[model samples]
Target: ENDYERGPDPTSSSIEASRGPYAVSTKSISRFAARGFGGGTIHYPTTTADGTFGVVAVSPGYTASESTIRWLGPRLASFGFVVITFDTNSRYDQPRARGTQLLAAIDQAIGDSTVGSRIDPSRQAVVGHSMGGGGTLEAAKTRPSIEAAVGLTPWNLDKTWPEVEAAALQIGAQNDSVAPPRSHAVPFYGSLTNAERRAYLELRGASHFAPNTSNTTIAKYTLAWLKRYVDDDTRYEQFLAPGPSTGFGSAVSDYRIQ
Candidate 1:
């Protein structure tokens, strides 16, 4: 009877032991506007601390909402990071002209005192999933505030990578028919100069959507990567300093910095 009762409460102990030391809240800040691009609001998740460590501006996949990246924003806030995830103009069906608006949003976010002070303006990062990933790379080149970037199954392999002070982490999937590793990541990785700090990770048996938060396992890896770069958590050193041949799983491969 005791064993039977315990089986039903397997996760109860873990839940009881979980303590939330940080205070979390979600709010919409309308302090800035998008200029020369379609105007829209940016949603930010901030910690209660008086100072900010940095900011992560996330761009969601095609047809995906800003809410999709919300799963990540709170996790980042728990670690004392201020996160901003916004809907790109493309989310409104303006793909061709969305690039300018996306860039404008980045600028507006950095200029906000409430958002800017929390972030190390010189150490900011940009992250994107699917089509938004490609857009992030384009924005990073032109924006001086961005110091690092991560691309999750980025679409449109034909884009160029300009010289910037930021490093890049490109995560791709092998089974992704929409954006194959060879066709998308390989070409872009080849373009990086020896002076650039970059890593490319490929996951096997994973489709284009697998690298996203849709899969819990893939999301764990994604979160670890962000914590390493954005949160600057060195205790999780394996990811931050992985060897060249090192890969996360047989199902998932990585191109990392030494």
Candidate 2:
């Protein structure tokens, strides 16, 4: 019923596919030319036929470059989004600064980029891996207007996120040694009491770098969450509501929602 819904209706196989319906095109932005965040690539659906799509801004973890989170750009763009995976101004930038860069990327897409005319400024989301994941929470806390945020194996010294108002999804790795779920992911999801909608999904045998590669579980759920929240597309909610156990089998070890 939402006017913002894009692409074909959702199905199990469709959501699980590596690439969605839209044809994706990528444009690189240089660091010097970029205003706030270090420059990176913008992956967009090549069609203006869908009107304007929502924006998704992604950031990498601490000490990592933009290539660490590169897989997500084109993959997400095909699902009818304008996605940007960018480097931080500094490789050592902390979560607070990374959060600012995520916002800056969103502004860049909506105001100054080639896809500016193809984006709906009101509908946007943020995503990150590792320390960048913590930045996702920071971005949501800083901008309540953000519709969705996803953190992949996110690490942050600050675990409490009651201030986050976005629809938040925190993905953790069951076997993670770097940022163990016991200390990082679990507590962060628990503290999201103020988020409009929140969910936690722990990868059964994943590590801190699971998000750095191609992962079907991550792709499907991430796509589902974004569609459900950013596009207001309830058709994708079935995959998330009952948790991954029913549909995803053992790919997920822990899952809970509110």
Candidate 3:
């Protein structure tokens, strides 16, 4: 069920431009052998104001490049959050056959002093798209370092859940049968205990791949969500303000958080 193939265009003008903001002392480190992958690169951002802000580690969907999640990383950096995005195991020509690279990346981030200095070891979050969404959840469950998580159109092939992880948000598309809302998100919500803070958002007309870039209406909402939880940007609060008939999505398949 791998969704993407062929890495992103490294030479694309748009991608090059987007990399500017994030180039502030950032470097790519490959830890393929440890994770059993042929190779994987970690994109680490520069230090923040006080060198004490949460880090948002992003795992890309299957076969997608680390560049795919770059769209969101810089924006988070602009808000004073350190960001890391990487390819999962068995992706990007990485061999060794297991999809546990996300877990390895988490470990690497937590240990690496360069990343550790910028990241608030106590307050960390994980996010992923598509298959990476599932990987994000699995990482959060297995890695004690992750405090919050977000899954975007996460495919629920793996049914295991991490008991200690707190505060999770699952975002998906109503029209996506590949990762059906009822089957994927609903069950995860059901598993959450009363004390845990969890939310499910169903975005109408959003495809599984739509949220990666900031070109759609879903991107606007997605940014708002991240700002609220990850960056604590109060300006985005208005987007969450309820209205009788908001045009953000269709009534049948609108986004909701609870």
lDDT of each: 0.56, 0.92, 0.56
Best by TM-score: 2
- Cα displacement (angstroms), candidate 2, residue 34, comes to 0.9
Candidate 2 clashes between residue pairs 3 or more apart in a chain or in different chains: none
The local lDDT score (0 to 100) that residue 43 gets in candidate 2 is 95
* Tens digits of lDDT, candidate 2, 65-171: 99999999999999999999999999999889989999999999888547999999999999999889999999999998999999999989998998998999999
| TM-scores for every candidate against the unseen true structure | 0.72, 0.97, 0.71
Candidate 3 versus the native: TM-score? 0.71
Clashes of each: 4, 0, 1
Which ranges of candidate 3 are over 4 A from the true structure?
1-25, 31-48, 92-99, 158-164, 215-252
- Candidate 1: stretches off by over 4 Å: 1-21, 29-50, 92-99, 211-236, 243-251, 254-258
RMSD of 1: 9.0
Stretches of candidate 2 above 4 Å error? Answer: 246-249
RMSD of each: 9.0, 1.4, 9.0
Which pairs clash (backbone N, Cα, C closer than 3 Å) in model 3?
38-95
Of candidate 3, the 10-residue stretch with the lowest lDDT total is 2-11
Clashing pairs in 1: 52-118, 200-255, 202-253, 204-251
